[PDB]
Design a protein around this nucleic acid. Structure first.
Ligand SMILES: [Zn+2]
Ligand SMILES: [Zn+2]
Lengths: 110, 83, 50, 49, 48, 48, 48, 49, 215
DNA sequence: CAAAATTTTCGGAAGGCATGCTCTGTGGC
DNA sequence: ATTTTTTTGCCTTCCGAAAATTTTG
RNA sequence: GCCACAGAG
């Protein structure tokens, strides 16, 4: 929150006050800005860097299976592209990645 | 009572380089103090070369007392040691 | 590369010798000022060492 | 005979100051070592010391 | 001779186990290698 | 260790200062003055 | 808040996947969490 | 500049390794008669030989 | 769900396998078939119907083998227990100590989940004849004695230790030392004064034996 | 249950050491 | 009685302060 | 004598 008092260009701070309601108040000059029914937010959009789909491109020319997608209330697709991958230890089951062909929303299981 | 008998000797029968050096130094110090020699010295004067000649055909009167770390010692005749 | 006869045996050297003037400098470090030998001599008053 | 003689004379002779020998045999290559830049198995972003 | 940690003789069935490794094994290893080398030479002659 | 007479805590507090022999704090020979310079230990001893 | 760690080990600076000479892939990291790496599933703890 | 650090490294290594020696029972021991190695290098062979 | 349940079950299963291997390596009677207990049988045996880990069920007792009691005549049965609390205080530690003392166990292996308070670490030597060893589930996910760097440690009996000291003609204070709270010493449960023989594999010579003493 | 005593953990500062090994000269206090 | 620095790294011990844990009421 | 730089390998 970076806002400055229009009267004297000094930094504005938020205090609780006696009433318990927050206001944008200036500690230098007699100025306040109540926010009852008014929204204030200082959004800090963090930078987003491009990421490669580490599982993308693997659902091409592979066998299909008859598994219902979890979003059954929105669609009823049955055929899904499935394949097997070992991403765990050798003494526990080798996981399956399978994606619906109609709605996307990829998901995996063990 | 700490002497290991001659039959039960376990240390290697080869004379180490340090034993050779100490034996030569001791014999040269003895000869430099007018000790008799047991070789036919051919005009040699330096005690160290006389000591080397004495060791050459094993005519030197000393023995080596090797201390094992426990405390028992082991006596080896210099003429017995293989060089 | 000149062809030099050796002064010891007189025969021609079997390789041509790179022969010519080079500027050489005599440096100030001479062995007359560097040689030293002690045997016994003065000793320090505190530690009684040379 | 030759093999047995070479083996029996290759033993560490008692009384050897082997610790000092090892200390020198480790320190002296440190003198001979020049400082170079290395990397860990073909990737240039490591620069392992 | 190979002695166990207790201090008695070791049976032939378990001479090469880990807990019976002594200080002389290197010597034994040397002898084995020596024999192997000689055996190799003999094998070569046999092949000829 | 309290088995010896000198093994007490009060030994580690300065009560008697042993003045060192002058053979280990000797007076330096003269350089340009008839007087002789003294070691720092002797001067500190006089100050004490 | 945007500097908190939500996943991964707190001491691992970075991680790379190296393809070795024989073609198999190994995962080599910069950090001080050896136990957490060798306890992580998918990583052989007996060869790390 | 490498000699300045290498000299200190050699001094530390020797002041830590000077006391060891090979005893007459082929066990490497410190000056206080404590074993560091039961046989030198596992086989008791001199690197020099 | 997946992350909170299956990963925890797999970690607990691997910790159980490591604990079984540790108890087997001490000479206690554990059959070979019990240490490769697969995840399916572990779920069918020690897990709840809805899919929860029942750590009170997986606590058990171990008895020495005839070979171990032949070599070590003073060895008795142990009781290994897994705690359900995330952080153990002094109440549950005192309860475990009271259980160990009441059932007359020579030693007891305690496996906490997240952390142990420092007030309980000073309560472990409370029993004079018995000893208590505390382990972490995270520290038991992977076995350290199966690592390629760690060589074979084999603890020696009193007779074997005396034979070694007579063979090399030395007092026990002159041997190389291994600390207690060392990971391998904790794994094998060495007490003070015990001597362990270590089989080192050097490329120069082959296999050679070294010795260490616990301190 | 939360107030009070005890113990542990965590920092920043305060100390210390290193900053080769030998050797040859001068100049000023 | 205005007022520069002049290598760089590594290491242990100390010592309040705050946090964590147990212990009294 | 103490400091101070200057060089040699
Ligand atoms: Zn204002
Ligand atoms: Zn779908």
């Amino acid at each position: 929150m970076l806002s400055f008092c229009p009267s004297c260009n000094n930094m504005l701070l938020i205090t609780s006050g006696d009433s318990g309601v927050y206001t944008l108040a200036c500690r230098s000059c007699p100025y306040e800005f109540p926010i009852e029914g008014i929204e204030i937010y200082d959004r800090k959009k963090l930078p987003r860097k491009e990421v490669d789909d580490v599982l993308g491109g693997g659902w091409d020319n592979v066998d299909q299976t008859k598994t219902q997608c979890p979003n059954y209330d929105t669609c009823g697709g049955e055929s899904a592209y499935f394949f097997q991958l070992q991403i765990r230890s050798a003494d526990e089951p080798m996981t399956t990645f399978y994606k619906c062909v109609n709605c996307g929303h990829r998901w995996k299981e063990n | 009572e700490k002497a290991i008998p001659k039959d039960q000797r376990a240390t290697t029968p080869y004379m180490t380089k340090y034993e050779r050096a100490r034996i030569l130094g001791t014999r040269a110090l003895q000869i430099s103090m007018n000790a008799p020699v047991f070789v036919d010295l051919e005009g040699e004067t330096d005690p160290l070369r006389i000591a080397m000649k004495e060791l050459a055909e094993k005519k030197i009167p000393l023995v080596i007392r090797r201390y094992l770390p426990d405390g028992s010692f082991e006596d080896w005749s210099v003429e017995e040691l293989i060089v | 590369k000149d062809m030099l006869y050796s002064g010891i045996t007189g025969e021609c050297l079997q390789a041509y010798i790179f022969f010519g003037p080079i500027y050489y400098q005599k440096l100030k470090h001479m062995v007359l000022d560097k040689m030293h030998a002690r045997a016994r001599g003065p000793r320090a008053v505190l530690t009684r060492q040379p | 005979e030759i093999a047995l003689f070479k083996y029996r004379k290759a033993r560490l002779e008692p009384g050897t100051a082997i610790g000092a020998i090892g200390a020198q045999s480790i320190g002296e290559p440190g003198t001979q070592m020049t400082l170079k830049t290395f990397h860990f198995a073909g990737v240039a972003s490591m620069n392992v010391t | 001779v190979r002695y166990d940690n207790s201090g008695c003789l070791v049976k032939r069935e378990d001479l090469n186990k880990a807990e019976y490794v002594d200080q002389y094994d290197a010597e034994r290893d040397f002898y084995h290698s020596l024999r192997e080398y000689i055996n190799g030479k003999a094998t070569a002659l046999a092949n000829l | 260790d309290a088995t010896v007479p000198s093994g007490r805590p009060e030994t580690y507090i300065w009560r008697y200062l042993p003045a060192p022999p002058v053979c280990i704090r000797p007076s330096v020979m003269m350089q340009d003055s008839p007087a002789s310079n003294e070691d720092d230990l002797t001067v500190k001893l006089t100050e004490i | 808040l945007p500097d908190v760690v939500v996943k991964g080990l707190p001491d691992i600076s970075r991680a790379v996947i190296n393809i070795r000479d024989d073609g198999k892939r190994e995962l080599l990291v910069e950090g001080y969490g050896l136990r957490d790496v060798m306890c992580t599933d998918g990583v052989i703890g007996s060869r790390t | 500049v490498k000699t300045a650090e290498t000299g200190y490294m050699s001094r530390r290594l020797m002041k830590s390794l000077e006391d060891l020696s090979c005893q007459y029972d082929n066990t490497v021991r410190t000056s206080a008669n404590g074993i560091v190695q039961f046989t030198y290098g596992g086989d008791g062979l001199d690197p020099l030989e | 769900m997946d992350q909170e349940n299956e990963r925890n079950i797999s970690r607990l299963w691997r910790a159980f396998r490591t604990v079984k291997e540790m108890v087997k390596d001490r000479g206690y009677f554990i059959t070979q078939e019990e240490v490769e207990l697969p995840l399916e049988d572990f779920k069918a045996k020690y897990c709840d119907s809805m899919g929860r880990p029942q750590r009170k069920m997986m606590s058990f007792q171990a008895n020495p083998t005839e070979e171990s009691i032949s070599k070590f005549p003073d060895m008795g049965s142990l009781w290994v227990e897994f705690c359900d609390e995330p952080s153990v205080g002094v109440k549950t530690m005192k309860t475990f100590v009271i259980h160990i003392q009441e059932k007359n166990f020579q030693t007891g292996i305690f496996v906490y989940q997240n952390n142990i308070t420092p007030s309980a670490m000073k309560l472990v030597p409370s029993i004079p004849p018995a000893t208590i060893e505390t382990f972490n589930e995270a520290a038991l996910v992977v076995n350290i004695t199966h690592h390629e760097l760690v060589p074979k440690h084999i603890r020696l009996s009193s007779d074997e230790k005396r034979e070694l000291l007579k063979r090399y003609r030395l007092k026990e204070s002159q041997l190389p030392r291994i600390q207690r709270a060392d990971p391998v010493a904790l794994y094998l449960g060495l007490k003070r004064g015990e001597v362990v023989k270590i089989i080192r594999k050097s490329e120069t010579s082959g296999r050679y034996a070294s010795y260490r003493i616990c301190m």
